[PDB]
From a paper:
Te_[name] and Pm_PhnD have 2–4 orders of magnitude higher binding affinity for phosphite than phosphate and phosphonates, but whilst attempts to crystallise complexes of either protein with ethylphosphonate (EPn), 2AEPn or phosphate were unsuccessful, structures of both proteins in complex with methylphosphonate (MPn) were obtained. The overall fold of the Te_[name] and Pm_PhnD complexes with MPn were very similar to the comparative complexes with phosphite (RMSD cα: ~0.3 Å) and since both MPn complexes were determined at high resolution (1.41–1.52 Å), the electron density for the ligand could be confidently interpreted within the binding pocket, with the MPn refining unequivocally in only one orientation. Given this similarity, it was unsurprising that the three oxygen atoms and the phosphorus atom of the MPn bind in the same position as those of the phosphite, with the methyl group of the MPn pointing in the same direction as the R1 hydrogen of the phosphite, towards the capping tyrosine residue (Y208/Y206). To accommodate the methyl group of the MPn the tyrosine moves in both structures by ~0.5 Å, compared to the complexes with phosphite, resulting in an ~16% expansion in the volume of the binding pocket. Despite this movement, the methyl-carbon atom of the MPn lies ~3.0 Å from the plane of the tyrosine ring in both structures. This might suggest that a C-H…π interaction is present, however the relative geometry of the two partners is sub-optimal for this type of interaction. Thermal ellipsoids were calculated from the anisotropic B-factors for the three structures that were better than 1.5 Å resolution (Te_[name] and Pm_PhnD with MPn and Pm_PhnD with phosphite).
Residue numbers in the entry: 9 to 268
Write the structure that this text describes.
């Protein structure tokens, strides 16, 4: 188990499994050649399931969301090591979006309506947009109805089709969904955008052989291939450590969220 021949690699189900797998094929092939190991991918049904599988010691690498990383780290022997870098920044934002047909173009128009969030353990499709709504005196179950639709693509689709009047999701995913034709830009209005949060961490099992750990980190750092990272509109990977996610811990405290 310190130097396995094949690596079990989990990817966050932030969108449909097909989409996540397809976007990662380039990276998988690169890493298999760089490391001379076979990679075997796993995409869970939901974020909590991925956390559980990490906590049980089944994974060698895992591409977590920021919040789901913080949660896993409480009960898993894992460490973050890399994150996507774009135009020199290693952060991303959440959006609050509204249904255009219903004229949902401000926070005031959310009141008394349906707000879609993704997975309960989502940073950019739950915690962050919820915080943004709270700062605008909107409170779930008091002056709006919340629905958890389980993923970012599910949020965008729900808002675009008017099943939900507003929603919160990843800015990069929203962009990708528009660029790929999945979402019609004319059917949604951007209401607000969040402050920058740290990018998703790539993580590894901490009891992998120290030489292998370095090889893995170095492999990510060495990647110079805009084509491989094109699905993520990214330049390169940079380094990250556990402390970079303290901002997410702090937000989780602010909102008094109970994952236990
Ligand atoms: Mg493979
Ligand atoms: Mg699911």
């Amino acid at each position: 188990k310190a130097n396995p021949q094949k690596l079990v690699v989990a990817l966050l189900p932030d969108e449909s499994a097909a989409t996540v797998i397809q976007n990662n094929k380039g990276l998988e092939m690169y890493l298999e050649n760089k490391l001379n190991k076979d990679i075997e991918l796993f995409v869970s049904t939901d974020y909590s399931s991925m956390i559980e599988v990490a906590s049980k010691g089944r994974l060698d690498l895992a591409y977590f969301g920021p919040l789901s990383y913080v949660l896993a780290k409480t009960k898993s022997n894992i460490e973050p090591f890399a994150a996507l870098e774009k135009d020199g920044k290693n952060t991303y934002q959440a959006l609050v979006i509204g249904n255009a047909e219903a004229g949902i173009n401000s926070y005031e128009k959310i009141e008394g309506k349906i707000m879609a969030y993704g997975d309960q353990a989502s940073t950019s499709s739950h915690l962050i947009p919820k915080s943004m709504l709270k700062q605008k005196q909107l409170k779930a179950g008091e002056n709006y109805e919340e629905v958890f639709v389980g993923a970012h693509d599910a949020v965008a689709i729900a808002v675009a089709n008017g099943k939900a009047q507003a929603g919160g999701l990843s800015k990069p995913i929203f962009t990708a969904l528009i660029e790929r034709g999945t979402i019609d830009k004319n059917k949604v209005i951007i209401i607000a955008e969040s402050k920058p949060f740290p990018q998703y961490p790539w993580t590894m099992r901490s009891d992998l052989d120290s030489e292998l750990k370095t090889q893995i980190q170095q492999a990510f750092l060495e990647l110079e291939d805009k084509a491989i990272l094109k699905p993520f509109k990214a330049d390169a990977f940079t380094l990250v450590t556990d402390q970079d996610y303290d901002v997410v811990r702090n937000l989780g405290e602010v909102l008094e969220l109970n994952f236990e």
